[model samples]
Target: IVCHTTATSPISAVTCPPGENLCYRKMWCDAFCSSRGKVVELGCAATCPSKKPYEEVTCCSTDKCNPHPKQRPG
Candidate 1:
């Protein structure tokens, strides 16, 4: 599987060894999860992770899907 691994500042994409089938992304909302925050990450995932306060987590089953890190105004 292939997914972006650069969580920071094209990323430097990465290829999964095996068993991974999802792209990873995360974001933080400052206004009660309704507004966007500066914190965002774009990476790879095998499964979706748990959500935290003022934060959103998402994963997709395709390459480069994690490119959209900030689901702002969400």
Candidate 2:
């Protein structure tokens, strides 16, 4: 999944395996929950123009940090 801050910076598209959900900005929670071990890491570091940087965006889950669900075949 590809996540981009609406700051208009050049963002590298993130690729995911088939059946994986694509997470763009607001859908981080869904991507985190659905794609456990598998991750669509950004090719470049994200940049934010606002004083409240993009990293400050609240996330329901941590990035490959928290102990969440294991991968299960659908």
Candidate 3:
């Protein structure tokens, strides 16, 4: 399971695409401290939404675990 984006590039592992649900997303924007992140194995098709400068937003099911966000979530 792999679908990644620190802005792009890096995607290998496969699976998770029949009704899709495996997401890990982290976003940050402080008008100068810009950061946007993602690791989606086959994400969002039911409900996954977050906003307001997006400090963090994580969704998980299993396989790949979808992890990477050690800071910024305020």
Candidate 4:
């Protein structure tokens, strides 16, 4: 017998408004936004990089961004 499992991806939508970005509270920026349970650490924030014309953004997550699925060997 064999079993299969599906994998899931992390949320990729920005919690902030358009043209707005979130960064670590400690980081210096034109504006700031915060989330619960270390959203910044979980990749849930945005910032302007020197190489980019637009703001770099990420989504916040209290849990693992992506979890692995379990399945038996075929």
Give all TM-scores, in the order shown: 0.41, 0.18, 0.22, 0.18
lDDT of 1 by residue, 1-74 (tens): 35664445345444655555444556554355444445454545577767666557556554444534545785
Model 3 lDDT tens row, 1-74? 33343433355344444433344443444345433454222343434566444255454344333455456867
Please, what are the lDDT tens digits per residue for candidate 4 over residues 1-74? 00111234443343443333343222223455564332122222344343234442232132222222324788
Cα lDDT of model 2 by residue, 1-74, tens digit? 24332224454244433222233222123224556543333322233222243332222122222122345778
* Model 1 alpha-carbon miss at residue 29, Å: 8.7
Tell me how far candidate 4 lies from the true structure as C-alpha RMSD in angstroms: 13.3
Better of 2 and 3 by lDDT: 3
lDDT of 4 at 11: 39
Clashing pairs for predicted structure model 1, backbone only? none
**lDDT (0-100) at residue 15 of candidate 4?**
46
Q: How high is the lDDT of residue 17 in model 3?
A: 43
Off by over 4 Å in 4: 1-8, 23-74
For model 1 the TM-score comes to 0.41
Clashing pairs in 2: none
Counting only residues 3 or more apart in sequence or on different chains, how many pairs clash (N, Cα, C under 3 Å) in candidate 3?
Answer: 0
For model 3, the stretches where C-alpha displacement exceeds 4 angstroms are 1-18, 22-45, 58-65, 69-74
Candidate 3 — which pairs collide? none
